[PDB]
Amino acid sequence: MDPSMGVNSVTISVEGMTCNSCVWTIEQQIGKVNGVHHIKVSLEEKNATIIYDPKLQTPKTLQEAIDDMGFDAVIHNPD
Ligand SMILES: [Cu+]
């Protein structure tokens, strides 16, 4: 019904985080950063893609939440 009635998705390329602590620290950070209806990070697939509310948030906080955690982030969705 509402997989994303009023939200958007963003995929961030990541690197240098091939250790559990990067998926539980980026999933816990992005997942609870603001409104992440679904967050998918993968220390081995080297990417972090999630969904967020573009009405109150945007891919700048997802880039600030990945930049805040400490992992090379190269989002390839809007740009
Ligand atoms: Cu780690």
Side-chain angles (χ1 to χ4, degrees):
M1 283 89 148
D2 309 271
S4 272
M5 221 256 190
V7 278
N8 247 236
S9 182
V10 139
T11 301
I12 304 161
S13 323
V14 203
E15 240 293 72
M17 7 78 61
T18 316
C19 122
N20 299 336
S21 90
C22 303
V23 84
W24 125 107
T25 216
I26 285 289
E27 174 273 303
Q28 280 304 301
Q29 180 61 302
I30 287 177
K32 272 124 79 244
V33 115
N34 247 134
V36 167
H37 300 259
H38 169 114
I39 162 270
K40 190 248 110 238
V41 64
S42 222
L43 310 193
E44 81 273 77
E45 158 227 67
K46 258 54 183 179
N47 227 285
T49 189
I50 75 107
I51 173 284
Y52 56 104
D53 227 273
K55 325 211 282 307
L56 64 108
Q57 251 303 352
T58 226
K60 87 103 230 165
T61 258
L62 279 89
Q63 184 88 84
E64 123 197 297
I66 194 92
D67 187 75
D68 152 89
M69 280 327 303
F71 295 110
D72 281 78
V74 174
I75 68 172
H76 62 64
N77 249 114
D79 313 282

Coordinates of all heavy atoms in Angstrom, one line a residue:
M1 N 0.9 -1.2 0.0 CA 0.0 0.0 0.0 C 0.9 1.3 0.0 O 0.9 2.0 -0.9 CB -0.8 -0.1 1.3 CG -2.0 -1.1 1.1 SD -1.4 -2.7 1.6 CE -3.0 -3.4 2.2
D2 N 1.6 1.5 1.1 CA 2.5 2.7 1.1 C 4.0 2.3 1.3 O 4.5 2.5 2.4 CB 2.0 3.5 2.4 CG 0.5 3.6 2.3 OD1 0.0 4.6 1.7 OD2 -0.2 2.8 2.8
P3 N 4.5 1.8 0.2 CA 6.0 1.5 0.3 C 6.8 2.8 0.3 O 8.0 2.8 0.7 CB 6.2 0.7 -1.1 CG 5.1 1.2 -2.0 CD 3.9 1.6 -1.1
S4 N 6.2 3.9 -0.1 CA 6.9 5.2 -0.1 C 5.9 6.3 -0.5 O 6.2 7.2 -1.3 CB 8.0 5.1 -1.1 OG 9.2 4.6 -0.4
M5 N 4.6 6.2 -0.1 CA 3.6 7.2 -0.5 C 4.1 8.6 -0.5 O 3.8 9.4 -1.4 CB 2.5 7.1 0.6 CG 1.1 7.2 -0.1 SD 0.4 8.8 0.2 CE -1.3 8.4 -0.4
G6 N 5.0 9.0 0.4 CA 5.5 10.4 0.3 C 7.0 10.4 0.8 O 7.4 11.3 1.6
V7 N 7.8 9.6 0.3 CA 9.3 9.6 0.6 C 10.1 9.2 -0.6 O 9.6 9.0 -1.7 CB 9.5 8.5 1.7 CG1 9.1 9.0 3.1 CG2 8.6 7.2 1.4
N8 N 11.4 9.3 -0.5 CA 12.3 9.0 -1.7 C 13.5 8.0 -1.3 O 13.7 7.8 -0.1 CB 12.9 10.3 -2.1 CG 12.3 10.7 -3.5 OD1 13.1 10.9 -4.4 ND2 11.0 10.7 -3.6
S9 N 14.2 7.4 -2.2 CA 15.3 6.5 -1.9 C 16.6 7.1 -2.4 O 16.7 7.8 -3.3 CB 15.0 5.2 -2.7 OG 16.0 4.3 -2.4
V10 N 17.7 6.7 -1.7 CA 19.0 7.3 -2.1 C 20.1 6.2 -1.8 O 20.2 5.6 -0.8 CB 19.2 8.5 -1.1 CG1 20.7 8.5 -0.6 CG2 19.0 9.8 -1.9
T11 N 21.0 5.9 -2.8 CA 22.0 4.9 -2.7 C 23.4 5.6 -2.6 O 23.8 6.3 -3.4 CB 21.9 4.1 -4.0 OG1 20.6 3.5 -4.0 CG2 23.0 3.0 -3.9
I12 N 24.1 5.3 -1.5 CA 25.5 5.9 -1.3 C 26.6 4.9 -1.5 O 26.7 3.9 -0.8 CB 25.5 6.4 0.1 CG1 24.3 7.4 0.3 CG2 26.8 7.2 0.4 CD1 24.0 7.6 1.8
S13 N 27.5 5.1 -2.4 CA 28.6 4.2 -2.6 C 29.6 4.3 -1.4 O 29.9 5.4 -1.0 CB 29.4 4.6 -3.9 OG 28.4 5.0 -4.8
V14 N 30.0 3.2 -0.8 CA 30.9 3.4 0.4 C 32.1 2.5 0.3 O 32.2 1.6 -0.5 CB 30.0 2.8 1.6 CG1 30.6 3.4 2.9 CG2 28.6 3.2 1.5
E15 N 33.2 2.8 1.0 CA 34.4 2.1 1.0 C 35.2 2.2 2.3 O 35.0 3.1 3.0 CB 35.2 2.6 -0.2 CG 35.5 1.5 -1.3 CD 36.4 0.5 -0.7 OE1 36.0 -0.3 0.2 OE2 37.5 0.4 -1.1
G16 N 36.1 1.3 2.5 CA 36.9 1.3 3.8 C 36.1 0.9 5.0 O 36.4 1.3 6.1
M17 N 35.0 0.2 4.8 CA 34.1 -0.1 6.0 C 33.8 -1.7 5.9 O 32.8 -2.1 6.4 CB 32.8 0.7 5.8 CG 32.7 1.5 4.5 SD 32.3 0.3 3.2 CE 30.7 -0.2 3.8
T18 N 34.7 -2.4 5.4 CA 34.5 -3.9 5.3 C 34.6 -4.6 6.7 O 35.3 -5.6 6.9 CB 35.6 -4.5 4.4 OG1 35.7 -3.6 3.2 CG2 35.2 -5.9 3.9
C19 N 34.0 -4.0 7.7 CA 34.0 -4.6 9.1 C 32.7 -4.3 9.8 O 32.4 -3.2 10.0 CB 35.3 -4.0 9.7 SG 34.8 -3.2 11.3
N20 N 32.0 -5.4 10.2 CA 30.7 -5.3 10.9 C 30.4 -3.9 11.5 O 29.4 -3.3 11.3 CB 30.8 -6.3 12.0 CG 31.0 -7.7 11.5 OD1 30.6 -8.0 10.3 ND2 31.6 -8.7 12.2
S21 N 31.3 -3.4 12.2 CA 31.2 -2.0 12.8 C 30.7 -0.9 11.8 O 30.3 0.1 12.2 CB 32.5 -1.7 13.5 OG 33.3 -1.0 12.5
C22 N 30.9 -1.2 10.5 CA 30.5 -0.1 9.6 C 29.0 -0.3 9.1 O 28.4 0.7 8.8 CB 31.4 -0.3 8.4 SG 33.1 -0.2 9.0
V23 N 28.5 -1.5 9.2 CA 27.1 -1.7 8.9 C 26.2 -1.5 10.1 O 25.1 -1.0 9.9 CB 27.0 -3.2 8.4 CG1 26.9 -4.2 9.6 CG2 25.8 -3.4 7.5
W24 N 26.7 -1.8 11.2 CA 25.8 -1.6 12.4 C 25.9 -0.1 12.8 O 25.1 0.5 13.4 CB 26.2 -2.6 13.5 CG 26.6 -1.9 14.8 CD1 25.9 -1.8 16.0 CD2 27.8 -1.1 15.1 NE1 26.6 -1.1 16.9 CE2 27.8 -0.6 16.4 CE3 28.9 -0.8 14.3 CZ2 28.8 0.1 16.9 CZ3 29.9 0.0 14.8 CH2 29.9 0.4 16.1
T25 N 27.0 0.6 12.5 CA 27.1 2.0 12.8 C 26.5 2.9 11.7 O 26.1 4.0 12.0 CB 28.7 2.3 12.9 OG1 28.9 3.2 14.0 CG2 29.2 2.8 11.6
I26 N 26.4 2.4 10.5 CA 25.8 3.2 9.4 C 24.3 2.9 9.3 O 23.5 3.7 8.9 CB 26.5 2.8 8.1 CG1 27.9 3.5 8.1 CG2 25.7 3.3 6.9 CD1 27.8 5.0 7.8
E27 N 23.9 1.7 9.7 CA 22.5 1.3 9.7 C 21.8 2.0 10.9 O 20.7 2.5 10.8 CB 22.5 -0.2 9.8 CG 21.0 -0.7 10.0 CD 20.6 -0.7 11.5 OE1 21.3 -1.3 12.3 OE2 19.6 -0.1 11.8
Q28 N 22.5 2.0 12.0 CA 22.0 2.6 13.2 C 22.0 4.1 13.0 O 21.1 4.8 13.5 CB 22.9 2.2 14.4 CG 22.6 0.8 14.8 CD 21.1 0.7 15.2 OE1 20.7 1.4 16.1 NE2 20.3 -0.1 14.6
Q29 N 23.0 4.6 12.3 CA 23.0 6.1 12.1 C 21.9 6.5 11.0 O 21.0 7.3 11.3 CB 24.4 6.4 11.6 CG 24.6 7.9 11.4 CD 24.3 8.7 12.6 OE1 23.3 8.6 13.3 NE2 25.2 9.5 13.1
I30 N 22.1 6.0 9.8 CA 21.1 6.4 8.8 C 19.7 5.9 9.2 O 18.7 6.7 9.2 CB 21.5 5.7 7.5 CG1 22.8 6.4 6.9 CG2 20.4 5.8 6.4 CD1 23.3 5.7 5.7
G31 N 19.5 4.7 9.6 CA 18.2 4.2 10.0 C 17.5 5.1 11.0 O 16.4 5.4 10.9
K32 N 18.3 5.6 12.0 CA 17.6 6.6 13.0 C 18.1 8.0 12.8 O 17.9 8.9 13.6 CB 18.2 6.1 14.4 CG 17.2 5.0 14.9 CD 18.0 3.7 15.2 CE 18.7 3.9 16.5 NZ 20.2 3.8 16.2
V33 N 18.6 8.4 11.6 CA 19.0 9.8 11.4 C 17.8 10.7 11.3 O 17.8 11.8 11.9 CB 19.7 9.8 10.0 CG1 18.9 10.6 8.9 CG2 21.1 10.4 10.2
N34 N 16.7 10.3 10.7 CA 15.4 11.2 10.7 C 14.2 10.4 10.3 O 13.4 10.0 11.1 CB 15.8 12.2 9.6 CG 15.9 13.6 10.3 OD1 16.8 14.4 10.0 ND2 15.0 14.0 11.1
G35 N 14.1 10.0 9.0 CA 12.9 9.2 8.6 C 13.4 8.2 7.5 O 13.1 8.4 6.3
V36 N 14.0 7.2 7.9 CA 14.5 6.2 7.0 C 13.6 5.0 7.0 O 13.7 4.1 7.8 CB 15.9 5.8 7.4 CG1 16.4 4.5 6.7 CG2 16.9 6.9 7.0
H37 N 12.6 5.0 6.2 CA 11.6 3.9 6.2 C 12.2 2.6 5.8 O 11.7 1.5 5.9 CB 10.6 4.3 5.1 CG 9.9 5.6 5.5 ND1 8.7 5.7 6.0 CD2 10.4 6.9 5.4 CE1 8.4 7.0 6.3 NE2 9.4 7.8 5.9
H38 N 13.5 2.6 5.3 CA 14.2 1.4 4.9 C 15.7 1.8 4.6 O 15.9 2.6 3.7 CB 13.5 0.9 3.7 CG 14.3 -0.2 3.0 ND1 13.8 -1.5 3.0 CD2 15.5 -0.2 2.4 CE1 14.8 -2.3 2.3 NE2 15.8 -1.5 1.9
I39 N 16.6 1.2 5.3 CA 18.0 1.5 5.0 C 18.8 0.2 4.7 O 18.7 -0.8 5.4 CB 18.6 2.1 6.4 CG1 20.1 2.1 6.4 CG2 18.0 1.4 7.6 CD1 20.6 0.8 7.0
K40 N 19.6 0.2 3.6 CA 20.3 -1.0 3.2 C 21.8 -0.7 3.0 O 22.2 -0.3 2.0 CB 19.7 -1.5 1.9 CG 20.2 -2.9 1.5 CD 21.1 -2.8 0.3 CE 22.6 -3.1 0.7 NZ 23.3 -1.9 0.2
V41 N 22.6 -1.0 4.0 CA 24.0 -0.8 3.9 C 24.7 -2.2 3.8 O 24.1 -3.2 4.2 CB 24.5 -0.1 5.2 CG1 24.2 -1.0 6.4 CG2 26.0 0.2 5.2
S42 N 25.9 -2.3 3.2 CA 26.5 -3.6 3.0 C 28.0 -3.5 2.9 O 28.6 -3.2 1.9 CB 26.0 -4.1 1.7 OG 25.6 -5.5 1.8
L43 N 28.7 -3.6 4.0 CA 30.2 -3.5 4.1 C 30.9 -4.3 3.0 O 32.0 -4.0 2.6 CB 30.6 -4.1 5.5 CG 29.8 -3.5 6.6 CD1 30.4 -3.8 8.0 CD2 29.7 -2.0 6.4
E44 N 30.3 -5.3 2.4 CA 30.9 -6.1 1.3 C 30.4 -5.6 -0.1 O 31.2 -5.5 -1.0 CB 30.6 -7.6 1.6 CG 29.2 -8.0 1.1 CD 28.2 -7.7 2.2 OE1 27.8 -6.5 2.3 OE2 27.7 -8.6 2.8
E45 N 29.2 -5.3 -0.2 CA 28.7 -4.8 -1.5 C 29.2 -3.3 -1.7 O 29.0 -2.7 -2.7 CB 27.1 -4.9 -1.4 CG 26.4 -4.0 -2.4 CD 25.3 -3.3 -1.7 OE1 25.6 -2.5 -0.8 OE2 24.1 -3.5 -2.0
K46 N 29.8 -2.8 -0.6 CA 30.4 -1.4 -0.7 C 29.3 -0.3 -1.0 O 29.6 0.7 -1.7 CB 31.4 -1.4 -1.8 CG 32.8 -1.5 -1.2 CD 32.9 -2.7 -0.2 CE 34.2 -2.7 0.5 NZ 34.1 -3.9 1.4
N47 N 28.1 -0.5 -0.6 CA 27.0 0.6 -0.9 C 26.0 0.7 0.3 O 25.7 -0.2 1.0 CB 26.4 0.1 -2.1 CG 26.3 1.3 -3.1 OD1 25.5 2.1 -3.0 ND2 27.1 1.3 -4.1
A48 N 25.5 1.9 0.4 CA 24.4 2.1 1.4 C 23.2 2.8 0.8 O 23.3 4.0 0.5 CB 25.1 3.0 2.5
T49 N 22.2 2.1 0.6 CA 21.0 2.7 0.0 C 19.8 2.7 0.9 O 19.5 1.7 1.6 CB 20.7 1.9 -1.3 OG1 19.7 2.6 -2.1 CG2 20.2 0.5 -1.0
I50 N 19.1 3.8 1.0 CA 17.9 3.8 2.0 C 16.8 4.7 1.4 O 16.9 5.2 0.3 CB 18.5 4.5 3.3 CG1 18.7 6.0 3.0 CG2 19.8 3.8 3.6 CD1 17.6 6.7 3.8
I51 N 15.7 4.8 2.2 CA 14.6 5.7 1.7 C 14.4 6.7 2.8 O 14.7 6.5 4.0 CB 13.4 4.7 1.6 CG1 12.1 5.5 1.4 CG2 13.2 4.0 2.9 CD1 11.7 6.2 2.6
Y52 N 14.0 7.9 2.4 CA 13.9 9.0 3.4 C 12.8 10.0 3.0 O 12.3 10.0 1.9 CB 15.3 9.7 3.4 CG 15.6 10.1 2.0 CD1 15.5 11.5 1.7 CD2 16.0 9.2 1.1 CE1 15.8 11.9 0.3 CE2 16.3 9.6 -0.2 CZ 16.2 10.9 -0.6 OH 16.5 11.3 -1.9
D53 N 12.4 10.8 3.9 CA 11.3 11.8 3.7 C 12.0 13.1 3.0 O 12.6 13.9 3.7 CB 10.8 12.1 5.0 CG 9.2 12.1 5.0 OD1 8.7 13.1 4.7 OD2 8.7 11.1 5.2
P54 N 11.7 13.3 1.8 CA 12.2 14.5 1.1 C 11.4 15.7 1.4 O 11.7 16.9 1.1 CB 12.0 14.2 -0.4 CG 10.9 13.2 -0.5 CD 10.9 12.4 0.8
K55 N 10.3 15.5 2.1 CA 9.4 16.6 2.6 C 10.1 17.4 3.8 O 10.0 18.6 3.9 CB 8.1 16.0 3.1 CG 7.8 14.7 2.2 CD 6.3 14.5 2.1 CE 5.7 13.9 3.3 NZ 6.5 12.6 3.5
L56 N 10.8 16.7 4.6 CA 11.5 17.3 5.8 C 13.0 17.0 5.7 O 13.8 17.7 6.4 CB 10.9 16.7 7.0 CG 11.1 15.2 7.1 CD1 12.2 14.9 8.2 CD2 9.8 14.5 7.4
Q57 N 13.5 16.0 5.0 CA 14.9 15.7 4.9 C 15.4 15.5 3.4 O 14.6 15.7 2.5 CB 15.0 14.4 5.6 CG 15.8 14.6 7.0 CD 17.1 15.2 6.7 OE1 17.6 15.4 5.6 NE2 17.8 15.7 7.7
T58 N 16.6 15.2 3.2 CA 17.1 15.1 1.8 C 18.5 14.4 1.8 O 19.0 14.1 2.8 CB 17.1 16.5 1.2 OG1 16.5 16.6 0.0 CG2 18.6 17.0 1.1
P59 N 18.9 14.0 0.6 CA 20.2 13.3 0.4 C 21.4 14.1 1.0 O 22.6 13.7 0.8 CB 20.4 13.1 -1.1 CG 19.5 14.1 -1.7 CD 18.3 14.3 -0.8
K60 N 21.2 15.3 1.6 CA 22.3 16.1 2.2 C 22.6 15.6 3.6 O 23.7 15.6 4.1 CB 21.9 17.5 2.1 CG 21.0 17.9 3.3 CD 21.9 18.8 4.3 CE 21.8 18.2 5.7 NZ 23.0 18.8 6.4
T61 N 21.5 15.1 4.3 CA 21.7 14.6 5.7 C 22.2 13.1 5.6 O 22.9 12.6 6.4 CB 20.3 14.7 6.3 OG1 20.3 15.8 7.1 CG2 20.0 13.4 7.1
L62 N 21.8 12.5 4.5 CA 22.3 11.1 4.3 C 23.8 11.1 3.9 O 24.5 10.2 4.2 CB 21.4 10.5 3.1 CG 20.1 10.1 3.5 CD1 19.1 11.3 3.5 CD2 19.6 9.0 2.6
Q63 N 24.2 12.2 3.3 CA 25.6 12.4 3.0 C 26.3 13.0 4.2 O 27.5 12.9 4.4 CB 25.6 13.4 1.8 CG 27.0 13.7 1.3 CD 27.3 12.6 0.2 OE1 27.0 12.8 -0.9 NE2 28.0 11.6 0.6
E64 N 25.5 13.6 5.1 CA 26.1 14.2 6.4 C 26.1 13.1 7.5 O 26.9 13.1 8.4 CB 25.2 15.4 6.7 CG 24.6 15.2 8.1 CD 23.4 16.1 8.3 OE1 23.6 17.3 8.3 OE2 22.3 15.6 8.5
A65 N 25.2 12.1 7.3 CA 25.2 11.0 8.3 C 26.2 10.0 7.9 O 26.8 9.3 8.7 CB 23.8 10.4 8.2
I66 N 26.5 9.9 6.6 CA 27.6 9.0 6.2 C 29.0 9.7 6.4 O 29.9 9.0 6.7 CB 27.3 8.7 4.7 CG1 28.1 7.4 4.2 CG2 27.7 9.9 3.8 CD1 27.3 6.2 4.5
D67 N 29.0 11.0 6.2 CA 30.2 11.7 6.4 C 30.5 11.8 7.9 O 31.6 11.9 8.4 CB 29.9 13.1 5.8 CG 31.2 14.0 5.8 OD1 32.0 13.7 4.9 OD2 31.3 14.9 6.6
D68 N 29.4 11.9 8.7 CA 29.5 11.9 10.2 C 30.1 10.6 10.7 O 30.9 10.6 11.5 CB 28.1 12.2 10.7 CG 27.9 11.7 12.1 OD1 28.2 12.4 13.0 OD2 27.5 10.6 12.2
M69 N 29.5 9.5 10.2 CA 30.0 8.2 10.7 C 31.5 8.0 10.4 O 32.3 7.6 11.3 CB 29.2 7.1 9.9 CG 27.8 6.9 10.6 SD 27.9 7.2 12.4 CE 29.2 5.9 12.7
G70 N 32.0 8.4 9.2 CA 33.4 8.3 8.9 C 33.7 7.2 7.8 O 34.5 6.3 8.0
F71 N 32.9 7.3 6.8 CA 33.1 6.2 5.7 C 33.1 7.0 4.3 O 32.1 7.7 4.0 CB 31.9 5.3 5.8 CG 32.0 4.5 7.1 CD1 31.1 4.8 8.1 CD2 33.1 3.6 7.3 CE1 31.2 4.1 9.4 CE2 33.1 2.9 8.5 CZ 32.2 3.1 9.6
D72 N 34.0 6.7 3.4 CA 34.0 7.4 2.1 C 32.6 7.2 1.4 O 32.2 6.1 1.1 CB 35.1 6.6 1.3 CG 36.5 7.2 1.7 OD1 36.9 6.8 2.7 OD2 37.0 8.0 0.9
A73 N 31.9 8.3 1.3 CA 30.5 8.1 0.7 C 30.5 8.8 -0.7 O 30.8 9.9 -0.9 CB 29.6 8.9 1.6
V74 N 30.0 8.1 -1.7 CA 29.9 8.6 -3.1 C 28.5 8.3 -3.6 O 28.3 7.4 -4.4 CB 31.0 7.9 -3.9 CG1 30.9 8.3 -5.4 CG2 32.4 8.3 -3.4
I75 N 27.5 9.0 -3.2 CA 26.1 8.8 -3.7 C 26.0 8.9 -5.2 O 26.6 9.8 -5.8 CB 25.3 9.9 -2.9 CG1 25.6 11.3 -3.5 CG2 25.5 9.8 -1.4 CD1 24.6 12.3 -2.9
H76 N 25.2 8.1 -5.8 CA 25.1 8.1 -7.3 C 23.6 8.1 -7.7 O 23.2 7.4 -8.6 CB 25.9 6.9 -7.8 CG 25.3 5.6 -7.3 ND1 24.0 5.2 -7.6 CD2 25.8 4.6 -6.5 CE1 23.8 4.0 -7.0 NE2 24.9 3.6 -6.4
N77 N 22.8 8.8 -7.0 CA 21.3 8.8 -7.3 C 20.8 10.1 -7.9 O 20.5 10.1 -9.1 CB 20.6 8.6 -6.0 CG 20.0 7.2 -6.0 OD1 20.4 6.3 -5.2 ND2 19.0 6.9 -6.8
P78 N 20.9 11.2 -7.2 CA 20.5 12.5 -7.7 C 21.6 13.1 -8.7 O 21.3 13.8 -9.6 CB 20.3 13.4 -6.5 CG 21.2 12.8 -5.5 CD 21.3 11.3 -5.8
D79 N 22.8 12.7 -8.5 CA 23.9 13.2 -9.3 C 24.6 12.0 -10.0 O 24.9 11.0 -9.4 CB 24.9 13.9 -8.4 CG 24.1 14.8 -7.4 OD1 23.8 15.9 -7.9 OD2 23.9 14.5 -6.3
Ligands
CU1 CU 33.6 -1.5 10.6

